[PDB]
Amino acid sequence: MIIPIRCFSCGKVIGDKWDTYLTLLQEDNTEGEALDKLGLQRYCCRRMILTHVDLIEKLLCYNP
Amino acid sequence: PSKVFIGKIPIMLRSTFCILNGVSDSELYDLNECPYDQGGYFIINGSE
């Protein structure tokens, strides 16, 4: 459910860096490589936005 | 004839004669279901 915020290995904040991420791999014709434009030189955490599942859009639609 | 009732038969979720079958994803949620369920099971006495 939603980006982890703070990568698992370092501290590099990733809560901020997704509302902007998704607006490239599906909205700018840049590669998975494009995240490099977000200051992701380390492995590391950058496999954080990448290996992530958006499990809330598909959970939020159960309205009580 | 007579159309009389003869006991009850437990249905298997997501079948040709189930309550869902041809229901679109967007409408499975409304019912508190999960578009990933693939049926296969019975819910007799409340448990799969």
Side-chain angles (χ1 to χ4, degrees):
Chain A
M1 319 74 177
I2 85 198
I3 326 130
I5 188 217
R6 262 167 186 273
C7 66
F8 285 155
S9 40
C10 320
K12 264 189 192 181
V13 255
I14 67 165
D16 57 345
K17 309 198 176 272
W18 166 259
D19 52 354
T20 99
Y21 176 64
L22 187 55
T23 89
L24 307 166
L25 263 82
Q26 303 172 5
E27 209 165 332
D28 186 46
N29 307 354
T30 54
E31 266 171 21
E33 191 283 339
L35 42 68
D36 287 35
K37 294 188 183 181
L38 287 72
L40 311 193
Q41 342 157 326
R42 276 204 278 317
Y43 277 45
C44 129
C45 14
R46 104 142 131 211
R47 61 73 162 101
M48 272 324 312
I49 36 48
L50 205 145
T51 189
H52 172 222
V53 170
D54 174 26
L55 249 194
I56 339 71
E57 181 191 1
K58 308 278 192 197
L59 207 169
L60 281 186
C61 48
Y62 283 91
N63 291 342
Chain B
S2 48
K3 68 168 175 184
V4 182
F5 158 94
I6 307 192
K8 286 175 190 180
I9 277 181
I11 300 202
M12 182 196 59
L13 290 181
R14 285 160 182 253
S15 79
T16 43
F17 287 101
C18 173
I19 298 183
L20 323 166
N21 181 21
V23 186
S24 61
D25 288 23
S26 64
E27 283 185 21
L28 292 167
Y29 298 127
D30 295 26
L31 270 168
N32 289 337
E33 300 171 343
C34 180
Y36 299 93
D37 290 13
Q38 298 220 327
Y41 53 104
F42 295 101
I43 82 175
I44 69 179
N45 276 341
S47 74
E48 330 264 20

PDB file of all heavy atoms in Angstrom, chain B residues 2-19:
ATOM      1  N   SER B   2     -46.703 -30.366 -10.362  1.00  0.00           N
ATOM      2  CA  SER B   2     -46.824 -30.000  -8.954  1.00  0.00           C
ATOM      3  C   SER B   2     -45.764 -29.024  -8.416  1.00  0.00           C
ATOM      4  O   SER B   2     -45.962 -28.429  -7.362  1.00  0.00           O
ATOM      5  CB  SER B   2     -46.861 -31.260  -8.090  1.00  0.00           C
ATOM      6  OG  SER B   2     -45.823 -32.146  -8.462  1.00  0.00           O
ATOM      7  N   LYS B   3     -44.651 -28.864  -9.133  1.00  0.00           N
ATOM      8  CA  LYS B   3     -43.561 -27.953  -8.730  1.00  0.00           C
ATOM      9  C   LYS B   3     -43.249 -27.937  -7.233  1.00  0.00           C
ATOM     10  O   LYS B   3     -43.316 -26.889  -6.598  1.00  0.00           O
ATOM     11  CB  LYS B   3     -43.819 -26.521  -9.222  1.00  0.00           C
ATOM     12  CG  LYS B   3     -44.995 -25.823  -8.544  1.00  0.00           C
ATOM     13  CD  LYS B   3     -45.035 -24.325  -8.847  1.00  0.00           C
ATOM     14  CE  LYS B   3     -46.291 -23.669  -8.256  1.00  0.00           C
ATOM     15  NZ  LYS B   3     -46.423 -22.222  -8.610  1.00  0.00           N
ATOM     16  N   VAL B   4     -42.889 -29.089  -6.676  1.00  0.00           N
ATOM     17  CA  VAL B   4     -42.612 -29.171  -5.247  1.00  0.00           C
ATOM     18  C   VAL B   4     -41.112 -29.116  -4.940  1.00  0.00           C
ATOM     19  O   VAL B   4     -40.294 -29.596  -5.722  1.00  0.00           O
ATOM     20  CB  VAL B   4     -43.231 -30.435  -4.622  1.00  0.00           C
ATOM     21  CG1 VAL B   4     -42.965 -30.480  -3.127  1.00  0.00           C
ATOM     22  CG2 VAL B   4     -44.728 -30.477  -4.893  1.00  0.00           C
ATOM     23  N   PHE B   5     -40.775 -28.520  -3.793  1.00  0.00           N
ATOM     24  CA  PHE B   5     -39.395 -28.333  -3.330  1.00  0.00           C
ATOM     25  C   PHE B   5     -38.784 -29.601  -2.736  1.00  0.00           C
ATOM     26  O   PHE B   5     -39.402 -30.257  -1.903  1.00  0.00           O
ATOM     27  CB  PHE B   5     -39.353 -27.204  -2.286  1.00  0.00           C
ATOM     28  CG  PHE B   5     -38.153 -27.250  -1.376  1.00  0.00           C
ATOM     29  CD1 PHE B   5     -37.008 -26.531  -1.672  1.00  0.00           C
ATOM     30  CD2 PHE B   5     -38.178 -27.999  -0.210  1.00  0.00           C
ATOM     31  CE1 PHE B   5     -35.908 -26.568  -0.835  1.00  0.00           C
ATOM     32  CE2 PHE B   5     -37.079 -28.039   0.632  1.00  0.00           C
ATOM     33  CZ  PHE B   5     -35.951 -27.322   0.319  1.00  0.00           C
ATOM     34  N   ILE B   6     -37.566 -29.922  -3.154  1.00  0.00           N
ATOM     35  CA  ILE B   6     -36.896 -31.142  -2.717  1.00  0.00           C
ATOM     36  C   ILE B   6     -35.494 -30.861  -2.200  1.00  0.00           C
ATOM     37  O   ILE B   6     -34.528 -31.027  -2.937  1.00  0.00           O
ATOM     38  CB  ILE B   6     -36.759 -32.160  -3.870  1.00  0.00           C
ATOM     39  CG1 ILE B   6     -38.116 -32.427  -4.517  1.00  0.00           C
ATOM     40  CG2 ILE B   6     -36.162 -33.474  -3.381  1.00  0.00           C
ATOM     41  CD1 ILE B   6     -38.101 -33.628  -5.452  1.00  0.00           C
ATOM     42  N   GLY B   7     -35.371 -30.448  -0.946  1.00  0.00           N
ATOM     43  CA  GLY B   7     -34.069 -30.161  -0.363  1.00  0.00           C
ATOM     44  C   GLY B   7     -33.291 -29.068  -1.085  1.00  0.00           C
ATOM     45  O   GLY B   7     -33.759 -28.518  -2.082  1.00  0.00           O
ATOM     46  N   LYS B   8     -32.097 -28.749  -0.594  1.00  0.00           N
ATOM     47  CA  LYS B   8     -31.298 -27.670  -1.179  1.00  0.00           C
ATOM     48  C   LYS B   8     -29.895 -28.091  -1.590  1.00  0.00           C
ATOM     49  O   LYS B   8     -29.243 -28.872  -0.899  1.00  0.00           O
ATOM     50  CB  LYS B   8     -31.228 -26.471  -0.238  1.00  0.00           C
ATOM     51  CG  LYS B   8     -32.528 -25.687  -0.194  1.00  0.00           C
ATOM     52  CD  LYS B   8     -32.524 -24.558   0.839  1.00  0.00           C
ATOM     53  CE  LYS B   8     -33.935 -23.959   1.003  1.00  0.00           C
ATOM     54  NZ  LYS B   8     -34.011 -22.840   2.001  1.00  0.00           N
ATOM     55  N   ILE B   9     -29.438 -27.563  -2.724  1.00  0.00           N
ATOM     56  CA  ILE B   9     -28.124 -27.895  -3.304  1.00  0.00           C
ATOM     57  C   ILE B   9     -27.153 -26.699  -3.329  1.00  0.00           C
ATOM     58  O   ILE B   9     -27.452 -25.685  -3.975  1.00  0.00           O
ATOM     59  CB  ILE B   9     -28.241 -28.416  -4.733  1.00  0.00           C
ATOM     60  CG1 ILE B   9     -28.579 -29.902  -4.740  1.00  0.00           C
ATOM     61  CG2 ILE B   9     -26.945 -28.199  -5.468  1.00  0.00           C
ATOM     62  CD1 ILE B   9     -28.680 -30.465  -6.133  1.00  0.00           C
ATOM     63  N   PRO B  10     -25.983 -26.823  -2.640  1.00  0.00           N
ATOM     64  CA  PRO B  10     -24.964 -25.779  -2.430  1.00  0.00           C
ATOM     65  C   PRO B  10     -24.230 -25.426  -3.701  1.00  0.00           C
ATOM     66  O   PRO B  10     -23.574 -26.284  -4.271  1.00  0.00           O
ATOM     67  CB  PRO B  10     -23.973 -26.443  -1.472  1.00  0.00           C
ATOM     68  CG  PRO B  10     -24.693 -27.594  -0.894  1.00  0.00           C
ATOM     69  CD  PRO B  10     -25.584 -28.078  -1.975  1.00  0.00           C
ATOM     70  N   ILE B  11     -24.327 -24.170  -4.118  1.00  0.00           N
ATOM     71  CA  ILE B  11     -23.759 -23.722  -5.387  1.00  0.00           C
ATOM     72  C   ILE B  11     -22.290 -23.350  -5.242  1.00  0.00           C
ATOM     73  O   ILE B  11     -21.848 -22.948  -4.159  1.00  0.00           O
ATOM     74  CB  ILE B  11     -24.539 -22.522  -5.961  1.00  0.00           C
ATOM     75  CG1 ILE B  11     -25.993 -22.918  -6.210  1.00  0.00           C
ATOM     76  CG2 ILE B  11     -23.893 -22.014  -7.227  1.00  0.00           C
ATOM     77  CD1 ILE B  11     -26.707 -22.037  -7.221  1.00  0.00           C
ATOM     78  N   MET B  12     -21.544 -23.505  -6.332  1.00  0.00           N
ATOM     79  CA  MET B  12     -20.126 -23.162  -6.366  1.00  0.00           C
ATOM     80  C   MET B  12     -19.873 -21.790  -6.983  1.00  0.00           C
ATOM     81  O   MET B  12     -20.222 -21.542  -8.144  1.00  0.00           O
ATOM     82  CB  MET B  12     -19.341 -24.200  -7.149  1.00  0.00           C
ATOM     83  CG  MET B  12     -17.861 -23.914  -7.181  1.00  0.00           C
ATOM     84  SD  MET B  12     -17.095 -24.876  -8.473  1.00  0.00           S
ATOM     85  CE  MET B  12     -18.031 -24.270  -9.884  1.00  0.00           C
ATOM     86  N   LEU B  13     -19.246 -20.911  -6.205  1.00  0.00           N
ATOM     87  CA  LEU B  13     -19.027 -19.531  -6.605  1.00  0.00           C
ATOM     88  C   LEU B  13     -18.403 -19.384  -7.986  1.00  0.00           C
ATOM     89  O   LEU B  13     -17.508 -20.139  -8.361  1.00  0.00           O
ATOM     90  CB  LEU B  13     -18.185 -18.810  -5.558  1.00  0.00           C
ATOM     91  CG  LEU B  13     -18.944 -18.589  -4.268  1.00  0.00           C
ATOM     92  CD1 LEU B  13     -18.060 -17.862  -3.283  1.00  0.00           C
ATOM     93  CD2 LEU B  13     -20.204 -17.799  -4.550  1.00  0.00           C
ATOM     94  N   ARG B  14     -18.891 -18.389  -8.728  1.00  0.00           N
ATOM     95  CA  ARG B  14     -18.460 -18.133 -10.101  1.00  0.00           C
ATOM     96  C   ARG B  14     -18.660 -19.337 -11.020  1.00  0.00           C
ATOM     97  O   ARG B  14     -17.706 -20.017 -11.395  1.00  0.00           O
ATOM     98  CB  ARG B  14     -17.022 -17.626 -10.148  1.00  0.00           C
ATOM     99  CG  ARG B  14     -16.885 -16.190  -9.706  1.00  0.00           C
ATOM    100  CD  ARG B  14     -15.455 -15.886  -9.307  1.00  0.00           C
ATOM    101  NE  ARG B  14     -15.325 -14.518  -8.826  1.00  0.00           N
ATOM    102  CZ  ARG B  14     -14.744 -13.540  -9.512  1.00  0.00           C
ATOM    103  NH1 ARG B  14     -14.232 -13.786 -10.713  1.00  0.00           N
ATOM    104  NH2 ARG B  14     -14.675 -12.322  -8.985  1.00  0.00           N
ATOM    105  N   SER B  15     -19.917 -19.579 -11.374  1.00  0.00           N
ATOM    106  CA  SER B  15     -20.267 -20.677 -12.259  1.00  0.00           C
ATOM    107  C   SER B  15     -21.183 -20.178 -13.357  1.00  0.00           C
ATOM    108  O   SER B  15     -21.441 -18.978 -13.466  1.00  0.00           O
ATOM    109  CB  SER B  15     -20.980 -21.782 -11.486  1.00  0.00           C
ATOM    110  OG  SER B  15     -22.341 -21.452 -11.271  1.00  0.00           O
ATOM    111  N   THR B  16     -21.663 -21.107 -14.170  1.00  0.00           N
ATOM    112  CA  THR B  16     -22.625 -20.788 -15.214  1.00  0.00           C
ATOM    113  C   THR B  16     -23.928 -20.312 -14.574  1.00  0.00           C
ATOM    114  O   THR B  16     -24.580 -19.398 -15.083  1.00  0.00           O
ATOM    115  CB  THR B  16     -22.893 -22.000 -16.105  1.00  0.00           C
ATOM    116  OG1 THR B  16     -23.040 -23.163 -15.280  1.00  0.00           O
ATOM    117  CG2 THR B  16     -21.734 -22.220 -17.063  1.00  0.00           C
ATOM    118  N   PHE B  17     -24.293 -20.931 -13.455  1.00  0.00           N
ATOM    119  CA  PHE B  17     -25.482 -20.519 -12.706  1.00  0.00           C
ATOM    120  C   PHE B  17     -25.119 -19.978 -11.313  1.00  0.00           C
ATOM    121  O   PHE B  17     -25.654 -20.439 -10.308  1.00  0.00           O
ATOM    122  CB  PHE B  17     -26.523 -21.661 -12.626  1.00  0.00           C
ATOM    123  CG  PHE B  17     -27.258 -21.939 -13.932  1.00  0.00           C
ATOM    124  CD1 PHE B  17     -26.893 -23.016 -14.731  1.00  0.00           C
ATOM    125  CD2 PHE B  17     -28.323 -21.137 -14.344  1.00  0.00           C
ATOM    126  CE1 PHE B  17     -27.563 -23.281 -15.932  1.00  0.00           C
ATOM    127  CE2 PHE B  17     -28.994 -21.400 -15.542  1.00  0.00           C
ATOM    128  CZ  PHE B  17     -28.614 -22.472 -16.335  1.00  0.00           C
ATOM    129  N   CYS B  18     -24.213 -19.001 -11.253  1.00  0.00           N
ATOM    130  CA  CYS B  18     -23.900 -18.323  -9.990  1.00  0.00           C
ATOM    131  C   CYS B  18     -24.407 -16.890  -9.992  1.00  0.00           C
ATOM    132  O   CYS B  18     -24.961 -16.428 -10.987  1.00  0.00           O
ATOM    133  CB  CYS B  18     -22.403 -18.329  -9.704  1.00  0.00           C
ATOM    134  SG  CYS B  18     -21.950 -17.336  -8.254  1.00  0.00           S
ATOM    135  N   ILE B  19     -24.211 -16.178  -8.889  1.00  0.00           N
ATOM    136  CA  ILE B  19     -24.762 -14.836  -8.764  1.00  0.00           C
ATOM    137  C   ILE B  19     -23.882 -13.795  -9.421  1.00  0.00           C
ATOM    138  O   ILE B  19     -24.202 -12.598  -9.411  1.00  0.00           O
ATOM    139  CB  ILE B  19     -25.021 -14.449  -7.295  1.00  0.00           C
ATOM    140  CG1 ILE B  19     -26.059 -15.400  -6.699  1.00  0.00           C
ATOM    141  CG2 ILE B  19     -25.480 -12.993  -7.182  1.00  0.00           C
ATOM    142  CD1 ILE B  19     -26.451 -15.090  -5.276  1.00  0.00           C
TER     143      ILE B  19
END
